[PDB]
Design a protein around this ligand. Structure first.
Ligand SMILES: [Zn+2]
Ligand SMILES: [Zn+2]
Ligand SMILES: [Zn+2]
Lengths: 64, 46, 263, 112
């Protein structure tokens, strides 16, 4: 259901990190590290993407 | 220009009234949505 | 130098670690929340959606845009449209933006870069979709398929974190003091050894350990505080401290003004 | 649905004062000040800077109820000394402290 602008817990933005992440996966095969480099330190902002379930993808396969 | 209802398949703006049948300008499929408003709608980010 | 003293630590463009010494905790905490909650910012508040074939609903999108960080450099020289003697809003008190996104290429994506700034800036850097992205298009709003359209129109306004979370430029703030529990304002939990079972904090490297032979100093109070002010963009971390000090002052101002009015 | 409008935590409504001061009969030279549209942010700050001024015989505060952003502050000082002044000074002292801070934060800054 798309990524959440700003993390609930602390507030830090997290909109941009999406495409970046899904790439550092496909190729560079990371998790922990990718994130670390994406500047996502403390678990609070962290859990947002790693727990995000992009439903929108299946929805987009729908007509209107 | 101008639109009333559209079709679930042949998305073609229609417009009708009583007894004038309840189908579409092709597709028999008798669905049809009742298209947006002209006066813009204002929402709250809450 | 003398009484209070500042001691900036490693600072960048999106952070400012630093040490505040010779001050009472009370005031640190006070200042703490002021950044977190009472600093003027600028966020969208009214959205006049024109077209939207997205799978997301109107107010679902409305919410999203509310949080997106906008510029706020000369944010201090503007008034709330509600206070502006203009019925509703205007350039002299509001900032309007447009957005149209039609799906033609039978997955089209909608990034925040596609926003124009049709309204009057009153000639001051502000009300701009703060981009720090390398290319120039931070925060991908959403994707759409075949023939899906989407026409918006955003209006931005002042406001603060109190009024709504979608404002505050803080977003997490570190605060610690006396890493080695010497003032004993806490009683550490443990199974056998406190020191070993309790993780040393990275701030523990800037202060000397307790040292046993010394008795408990009692007349000592909480002095020196290690913080860290993260930022989302919009306002330079420094202003995000100054303006705070100032807003607090502005409050402190009326606190002195209102006072007179009661004399 | 039943929650007030957010902007009611700081804007004063039609004829209502920020401050309300009441004299205390319980003991001589004492007052209870009702603060409207405020919280710990500004409260705790005033309370603190009063135990610095060894001329203040008492200084406490409280939040009547959490739903309403307000608070009452009760202060009592020595003989013939008005609290308001000590409040002014220590408040100014804050500004001075902050004036200094600002400055001390600017020179410090410049060296980068
Ligand atoms: Zn977080
Ligand atoms: Zn049809
Ligand atoms: Zn206006």
């Amino acid at each position: 259901m798309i990524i959440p602008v700003r993390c609930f817990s602390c507030g830090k933005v997290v909109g941009d990190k999406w495409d970046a992440y899904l790439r550092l996966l496909e190729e560079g095969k990371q998790e922990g590290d990718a994130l670390d480099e994406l500047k996502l330190k403390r678990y609070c902002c962290r859990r947002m993407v790693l727990t995000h379930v992009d439903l929108i993808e299946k929805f987009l396969r729908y007509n209107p | 220009y101008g639109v009333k209802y559209t079709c679930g398949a042949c998305a073609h703006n229609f417009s009708l009234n009583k007894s004038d049948p309840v189908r579409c300008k092709e597709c028999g499929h008798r669905v049809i949505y009742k298209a947006r408003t002209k006066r813009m709608s204002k929402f709250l980010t809450t | 130098s003398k009484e209070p003293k500042v001691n900036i630590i490693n600072a960048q463009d999106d952070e400012v670690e630093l040490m505040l010494s010779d001050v009472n905790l009370s005031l640190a905490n006070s200042l703490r929340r002021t950044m977190l909650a009472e600093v003027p910012t600028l966020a969208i508040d009214l959205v006049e959606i024109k077209m939207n074939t997205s799978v997301l609903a109107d107010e679902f999108i409305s919410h999203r845009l509310g949080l997106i960080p906008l510029v706020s450099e000369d944010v201090e020289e503007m008034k709330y449209s509600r206070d502006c003697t203009c019925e509703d809003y205007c350039d002299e008190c509001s900032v309007v933006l447009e957005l149209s996104a039609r799906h033609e290429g039978e997955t089209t994506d909608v990034y925040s870069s596609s926003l124009i700034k049709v309204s009057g800036p009153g000639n001051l850097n502000v009300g701009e979709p703060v981009r720090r992205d390398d290319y120039d298009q931070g925060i991908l709003l959403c994707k759409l398929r075949n023939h899906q359209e989407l026409n918006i129109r955003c209006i931005a306004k002042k406001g603060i974190a109190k009024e709504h979370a979608k404002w505050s430029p803080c977003s997490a703030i570190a605060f610690e003091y006396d890493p080695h529990n010497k003032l004993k304002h806490t009683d550490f939990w443990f199974e056998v050894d406190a020191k070993k079972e309790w993780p040393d904090s990275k701030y523990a490297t800037w202060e000397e350990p307790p040292k046993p032979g010394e008795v408990f100093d009692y007349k000592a109070k909480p002095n020196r505080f290690y913080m860290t002010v993260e930022t989302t963009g919009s306002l330079k971390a420094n202003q995000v401290f100054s303006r705070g000090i100032k807003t607090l002052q502005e409050k402190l101002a009326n606190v002195l003004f209102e006072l007179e009015n009661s004399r | 649905m039943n929650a007030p409008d957010r902007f009611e935590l700081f804007i004063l409504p039609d004829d209502v004062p920020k401050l309300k001061i009441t004299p205390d009969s319980r003991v001589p030279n004492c007052i209870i000040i009702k603060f409207e549209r405020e919280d710990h942010t500004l409260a705790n700050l005033l309370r603190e800077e009063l135990a610095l001024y060894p001329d203040v015989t008492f200084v406490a505060y409280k939040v009547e109820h959490p739903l309403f952003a307000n608070f009452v502050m009760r202060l009592q000082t020595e003989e013939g000394t008005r609290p308001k002044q000590a409040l002014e000074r220590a408040c100014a002292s804050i500004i001075n402290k902050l004036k200094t801070l600002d400055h001390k934060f600017n020179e410090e800054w410049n060296i980068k």
